[PDB]
């Protein structure tokens, strides 16, 4: 079931959100820290079904951006389907420290044989969204690498297909 959120624009008229057209829907693509969008709990991969009661179906990323900019007043209503493509997988580092994948540009690119990633069905061509409760969207690979390296044995990752 979708949920309704009401966002209040900031001083600058902004909500701290970038949207993207995927498969003829609209998805949240970047949520700024401490923003009108983060306040209402929007996350990378949330699907936006309506903006101010208007269907988003078939909208380009440009159209969606323009609609947000053109919205009358200070509040914007959105109807949201929470992260419809989320998969969260818990892995465990082996006795010598790795969970068993390689990534680049925030995307998993290979899975190591006989590893915890292999055991737990981690997939390639998937974006890394969260690690152990920490949002990593928008982080540099080196920052993601550091989070993985310093993690405790248990490494829980939320992934989504890279569309």
């Amino acid at each position: 079931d979708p949920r309704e959120v009401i966002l209040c624009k900031d001083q600058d008229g902004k909500i701290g959100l970038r949207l993207k057209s995927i498969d003829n829907g609209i998805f949240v693509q970047l949520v700024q820290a401490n923003s009108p969008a983060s306040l209402v709990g929007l996350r990378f991969g949330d699907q936006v079904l309506q903006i101010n009661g208007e269907n988003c179906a078939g909208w380009s990323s440009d159209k969606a951006h323009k609609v947000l900019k053109q919205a009358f007043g200070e509040k914007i209503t959105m109807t949201i389907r929470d992260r419809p493509f989320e998969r969260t997988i818990t892995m465990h580092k082996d006795s010598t420290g790795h969970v068993g994948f390689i990534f680049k540009n925030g995307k998993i690119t290979s899975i190591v044989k006989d590893s915890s990633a292999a055991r737990n069905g981690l997939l390639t061509e998937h974006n890394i969204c969260e690690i152990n409760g920490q949002n990593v969207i928008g982080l540099k690979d080196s920052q993601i690498a550091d989070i993985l390296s310093t993690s405790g044995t248990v490494v829980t990752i939320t992934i989504m297909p890279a569309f």
């Binding site: 790795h98 969970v99 068993g100 994948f101 390689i102 990534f103 680049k104 190591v112 690979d141 690498a145 993985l148 390296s149």
Partner: peptide, 4 residues
């Protein structure tokens, strides 16, 4: 990167 390397393996993680």
């Amino acid at each position: 990167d390397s393996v993680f």
